[PDB]
């Protein structure tokens, strides 16, 4: 709901600083943000979050990542 909200989270989610997050990288924060998760639950979420299906999530796609499903 805020342009800054997902923006500050990018420094928390993207450790490489390259502008994109992958399953293994997302898992690192997801296991603390949410519980009852397998590695596969993260990957299912990537496949549904990735609007263009290329295996990575950029800034605009990150907003959609959390509003998907
Ligand atoms: Ca990254
Ligand atoms: Ca993508």
Curated annotation (Swiss-Prot):
Phosphoserine found at: 2, 22
Consequence when changing residue 23 to V: In CPVT6; decreased calcium-binding affinity; not changed binding to RYR2; increased RYR2 calcium-release channel activity; decreased calcium-dependent inactivation of L-type calcium channel; not changed action potential duration
Description of post-translational modifications: Ubiquitination results in a strongly decreased activity.
Region (Necessary and sufficient for interaction with PCP4): 1-69
Binding locations of Ca(2+) 4: 50, 52, 54, 56, 61
EF-hand domain ranges (all copies): 1-36, 37-69
Phosphotyrosine: modified positions: 20, 59
List of residues binding Ca(2+) 3: 14, 16, 18, 20, 25
N6,N6,N6-trimethyllysine: residues bearing it: 36
Compartments reported by the entry: Cytoplasm, Cytoskeleton, Spindle; Cytoplasm, Cytoskeleton, Spindle pole; Cytoplasm, Cytoskeleton, Microtubule organizing center, Centrosome
N6-acetyllysine PTM positions: 15
Subunit structure: Interacts with MYO1C, MYO5A and RRAD. Interacts with MYO10. Interacts with CEP97, CCP110, TTN/titin and SRY. Interacts with USP6; the interaction is calcium dependent. Interacts with CDK5RAP2. Interacts with SCN5A. Interacts with RYR1. Interacts with FCHO1. Interacts with MIP in a 1:2 stoichiometry; the interaction with the cytoplasmic domains from two MIP subunits promotes MIP water channel closure. Interacts with ORAI1; this may play a role in the regulation of ORAI1-mediated calcium transport. Interacts with IQCF1. Interacts with SYT7.
Disease implication from the record: Ventricular tachycardia, catecholaminergic polymorphic, 6: An arrhythmogenic disorder characterized by stress-induced, bidirectional ventricular tachycardia that may degenerate into cardiac arrest and cause sudden death. Patients present with recurrent syncope, seizures, or sudden death after physical activity or emotional stress. CPVT6 inheritance is autosomal dominant.
Family indicated by similarity: Belongs to the calmodulin family.
Name the record gives this protein: Calmodulin-3
Encoding gene (name): CALM3
Full-protein positions shown: 81 to 149 of 149
